[PDB]
């Protein structure tokens with residue numbers, strides 16, 4: 243029905259969306275979004291932190307009740323779980339050293355190591371369009387160990403969403419020497435064009451009330467205020 | 481400039497204008513009306529919670545920049561803060577238990593304890609019109625503690641505004657044994673004709689602007705849309 247305590251699973255390795263801080267506290271625009279969605283439907287929310295590859299199964303095991311983890315909405319994920327309406331747009335791009343040639347293409351990526359987070363939409367674009375053409379796909383848990391292997395030379399490109407790379411790495415002094423290398427690779431039916439909150443297919447009423455609550459947060463100006471402490475561009479798109 | 485982020489003070493204990501849900505979300509007609517005014521004014525206002533007898537000092541100490549708290553536009557208060565245009569009408573009535581007397585005569589209040597919210601217009605009238613006359617005026621800090629002491633028999637009448645009493649108490653199942661009653665009590669100087677946002681006299685540009693935004697929420701229909709979430713009659717007047 244509408245559960246009185248909902249357990250939201252998150253992977254806390256993805257700034258600015260969800261990440262831990264000095265005071266250990268969970269922090270980020272997806273965290274802020276869910277806190278506000280929860281008050282608004284008026285129920286107690288607790289966050290469970292797990293790796294992103296474990297969330298979509300924990301949900302089907304009722305170990306958690308929602309997923310908020312910048313989880314992009316895609317045709318394939320949707321033939322297993324349900325999602326709210328679009329919370330904001332996502333785009334994928336590879337990050338490269340400023341001194342590395344590396345392309346969105348089997349050409350200059352041939353025989354290079356691209357790192358992807360396990361469970362993600364770009365781990366699966368990397369296996370279907372890119373490993374057969376000879377570029378090696380290295381999967382990780384913890385988005386922060388991918389950026390850390392990139393700056394150490396261990397991998398040659400880091401593959402993930404644009405705004406997290408941008409805000410969480412390239413605008414930080416550790417990504418000063420790095421850059422996006424190439425466009426966003428285009429695959430609308432694999433990547434999806436936005437993220438949402440993941441929910442079981444059978445919970446139609448907790449899904450309907452989250453959609454209403456979010457709708458309202460976009461119309462009274464609460465979304466624009468929550469977005470503005472992280473972004474100076476329009477995160478939502480349209 | 482014109483301020484980017486405005487502090488708004490509210491006492492959130494005055495259903496149906498401002499109150500909180502179990503999760504702390506500020507809810508009510510005054511909350512809706514502020515947020516649409518902020519959006520149209522293109523400003524980022526935030527709500528600070530404070531007992532209404534603190535709100536006019538807080539705005540003098542530049543800790544808040546606005547008051548939205550069902551504050552009556554009066555001439556006594558017009559001598560030290562400025563107000564916006566009339567947001568909606570306000571009337572004062574006493575709330576009394578069924579038949580149990582304290583009836584339409586000032587003499588029937590002699591020796592009875594009349595509960596009032598501290599800092600209010602009814603408090604100011606109580607001690608001018610009625611406390612010289614042998615009636616006991618008891619001031620409280622949250623409107624909810626005036627209705628629970630009425631119920632418990634610890635005071636004999638509760639004096640606050642008419643729509644708040646009726647929609648927050650009399651039409652709720654705790655208010656079933658109660659009614660309006662007591663002498664008709666008027667003083668146009670002390671009481672409003674209605675309510676406005678209260679601000680500093682110094683910040684005149686915000687008023688022209690909030691005034692403008694309000695004016696157009698009203699020809700456009702967003703006022704009527706917000707009011708019908710709450711009232712089945714004209715809250716504005718005519």
Ligand SMILES: N[C@@H](Cc1c[nH]c[nH+]1)C(=O)O
Pocket residue numbers: 256294311312313314332359361362363364402403437
């Ligand atoms: N939006 C992408 C990437 C990602 C989500 N969370 C962490 N990384 C996905 O859902 O797979």
Ligand SMILES: N[C@@H](Cc1c[nH]c[nH+]1)C(=O)O
Pocket residue numbers: 491494532549550551552570597599600601602640641
């Ligand atoms: N309108 C009345 C009563 C009140 C407003 N808020 C709480 N009580 C006043 O301004 O005093």
